[PDB]
């Protein structure tokens, strides 16, 4: 018999993104080639099957630095990290292949699905 | 020119609640009278003006244990902690006064507003 606040989840995610932009309580650095991205482990796990697996591992859960596979493009990662914290995906003709490959690697099934749909249309 | 995934924020919050239920990556204990509640600092900050102030403080940001004011009712806190992680508020005739008082203390303005509306109706 609960009541529900429709905008609560969106407002929580907006505040988590504000903490990210101000580098507050970020507990991990994701290294993609030369590029470094600071984030919250919980948000990464909530969005990605790959980070979920990494941070539930008894040894990796304690690492402050995670290095991604050298084939991963920093821009594709940046677009996906922004999507994790905002629900908005900056999908463009020039980045769609790098975004799909990065989403497949990160195990972000809904991003993979829309990339496959957008590629099929073109 | 981004696209948006409507269910993303709700899915993120659902996964953060699953991490909470399994005690994964919880980094703080909130003590309310004798009762203890494990949670994620980022989620608490995203939902509450009081926790936002506490964990942006250079000294308090590093505490693993936070003791609330002894007037705070553990059940009122439990109902609000569940709301933070689910968007669902278990508001009942027998708990509304304790829920409103706890929401005022935690600075959760939308919960305070609905409690004031529900009290006025009765």
């Amino acid at each position: 018999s609960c009541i529900q606040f429709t905008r609560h989840a969106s407002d929580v995610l907006l505040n988590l993104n504000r903490l990210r932009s101000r580098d507050i309580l970020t507990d991990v650095v994701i290294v993609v080639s030369r590029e470094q991205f600071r984030a919250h482990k919980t948000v990464l796990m909530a969005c990605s099957g790959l980070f979920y697996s990494i941070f539930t591992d008894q040894l990796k859960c304690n690492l402050s630095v995670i290095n991604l596979d050298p084939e991963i493009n920093p821009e594709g990662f940046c677009i996906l990290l922004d999507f994790m914290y905002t629900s908005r995906l900056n999908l463009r003709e020039g980045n769609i292949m790098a975004v799909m490959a990065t989403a497949m690697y990160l195990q972000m099934e809904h991003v993979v699905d829309t990339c496959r749909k957008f590629i099929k249309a073109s | 020119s981004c696209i948006q995934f409507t269910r993303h924020a709700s899915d993120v919050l659902l996964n953060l609640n699953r991490l909470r239920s399994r005690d994964i990556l919880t980094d703080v204990v909130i003590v309310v009278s004798r009762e203890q509640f494990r949670a994620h600092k980022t989620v608490l900050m995203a939902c509450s003006g009081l926790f936002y102030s506490i964990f942006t403080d250079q000294l308090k940001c590093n505490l693993s244990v936070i003791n609330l004011d002894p007037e705070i009712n553990p059940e009122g806190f439990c109902i609000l902690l569940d709301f933070m992680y689910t968007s669902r508020l278990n508001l009942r005739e027998g708990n509304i006064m304790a829920v409103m008082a706890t929401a005022m203390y935690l600075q959760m303005e939308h919960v305070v507003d609905t409690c004031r509306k529900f009290i006025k109706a009765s």
Partner: peptide, 4 residues
Amino acid sequence: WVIP
């Protein structure tokens, strides 16, 4: 607020 809604009835979910």
